[PDB]
């Protein structure tokens, strides 16, 4: 079993290297990790947190679970990260979402795609939960329509592919739920609306939650592997950092 | 060392694939068989990655088939220092591929079975490994 995982990692790294060369010569489709299951098998997602979460993080983890139609919330009490991912890989889980907080304020969100990666790490800003809305009511859990706005660079396409495959393929044409990821200077605004087509246009009503997620790391491996080769990382102390755009 | 047999296998792959190139491209009969050949070679482990028929013409080589030999497989896995030592272990019956003991050094391991090549449970070689690590557990008889 350990030998199979070791062998497949070398194949995975070799495949990404060859794909990178193939992309470069074309410079002069769906990613390999998602190509096999794109449009066939619906995603299987586990939403978890860090150890000893606050109540607010638990509520936020519940909201993220409702965001993705095929997400399941799992309690992280004493679970060891290599054991966590190994358990998820056994159960056929496709993606793993871990949330961090600071005094009950969500700070980070990391997405790990199984069996071999990639792992994407985000930082959450301006988080507004639906628990902060009085008399909000329940959500609609239909397969939602997706909007990806202002993703142009190759990294932007990479981020769209990772986020796109967290949802089920083939929403109904008349589904009234829409989830939007709008990139505005590398700060991806995430909103959830329910729309009603009017006779002279469209009207939308916000459900929530609101939060801005900014990618700062993308590694070729599962989140257990701190030694995974880094596909892309955010440089903060370069002199152009205050104005450089990436997505 | 004679690679007569593997040359025939490599050649027969070339002659067969050439005949598929002759058959009209739109035919479903050729397309199915071409994929089966690629799947078979991929299963055998000759093709490390899924390839096209044109690649299959040149990727197939005698060295590729030699790499799949059990004693060569053991050498890369570091079970044996040298190929000749690997052959001796195979003949003496210290190696198992899955639940089956393989005493024929010529045996070619398939791609799926590569992960399960290991020493037999009661091998004296295996006891030497665990004794070196001081991890020898007598409940498992090894």
């Amino acid at each position: 079993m350990l030998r199979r995982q070791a062998r497949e990692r070398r194949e995975y790294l070799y495949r990404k290297a060859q794909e990178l060369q193939d992309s470069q010569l074309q410079q002069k489709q769906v990613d390999d990790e998602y190509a096999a299951t794109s449009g066939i098998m619906d995603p299987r997602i586990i939403v978890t947190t860090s150890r000893d979460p606050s109540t607010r993080l638990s509520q936020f983890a519940k909201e993220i679970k409702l965001l993705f139609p095929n997400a399941v919330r799992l309690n992280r009490g004493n679970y060891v990260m290599p054991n966590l991912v190994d358990a998820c890989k056994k159960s056929g889980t496709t993606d793993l979402v871990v949330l961090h907080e600071h005094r009950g304020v969500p700070t980070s969100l990391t997405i790990s795609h199984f069996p071999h990666g990639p792992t994407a790490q985000f930082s959450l800003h301006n988080v507004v939960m639906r628990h902060d809305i009085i008399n909000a009511g329940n959500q609609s859990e239909v397969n939602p329509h997706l909007i990806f706005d202002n993703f142009t660079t190759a990294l932007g396409k990479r981020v769209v592919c990772i986020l796109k495959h967290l949802f089920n393929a083939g929403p109904k044409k008349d589904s009234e739920r829409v989830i939007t990821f709008a990139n505005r200077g590398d700060f991806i605004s995430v909103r959830q609306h329910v729309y009603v087509r009017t006779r002279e246009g469209v009207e939308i009503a916000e459900v929530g939650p609101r939060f801005e997620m900014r990618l700062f790391e993308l590694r070729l491996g599962t989140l257990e592997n701190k030694d995974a080769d880094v596909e892309w990382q955010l440089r903060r102390f370069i002199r152009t950092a205050n104005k450089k755009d990436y997505l | 060392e004679d690679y007569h047999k593997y040359n025939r296998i490599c050649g027969d792959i070339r002659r067969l694939a050439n005949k598929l190139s002759l058959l009209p491209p739109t035919d479903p009969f050729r397309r199915k068989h071409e994929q089966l050949l690629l799947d078979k070679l991929y299963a055998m482990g000759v093709l490390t990655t899924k390839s096209k028929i044109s690649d299959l013409e040149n990727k197939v080589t005698v060295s590729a088939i030699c790499r799949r030999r059990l004693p060569v497989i053991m050498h890369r896995l570091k079970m044996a220092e040298t190929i000749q030592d690997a052959v001796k272990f195979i003949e003496q019956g210290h190696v198992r591929v899955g639940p089956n003991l393989i005493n024929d050094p010529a045996y070619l391991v398939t791609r799926n079975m590569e992960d399960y090549v290991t020493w037999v449970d009661n091998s004296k070689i295996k006891k030497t490994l665990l004794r070196y690590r001081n991890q020898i557990d007598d409940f498992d008889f090894s």
């Binding site: 070398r10 790294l13 070799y14 | 790499r67 060569v72």
Partner: peptide
């Protein structure tokens, strides 16, 4: 490696030699 390496093991060995060079 009496019979050489496949494409994957060649890539892996090159990567290791690079890091060792660092």
């Amino acid at each position: 490696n009496p019979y050489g390496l496949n494409e994957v093991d060649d890539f892996a060995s090159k990567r290791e030699k690079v890091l060792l060079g660092q």
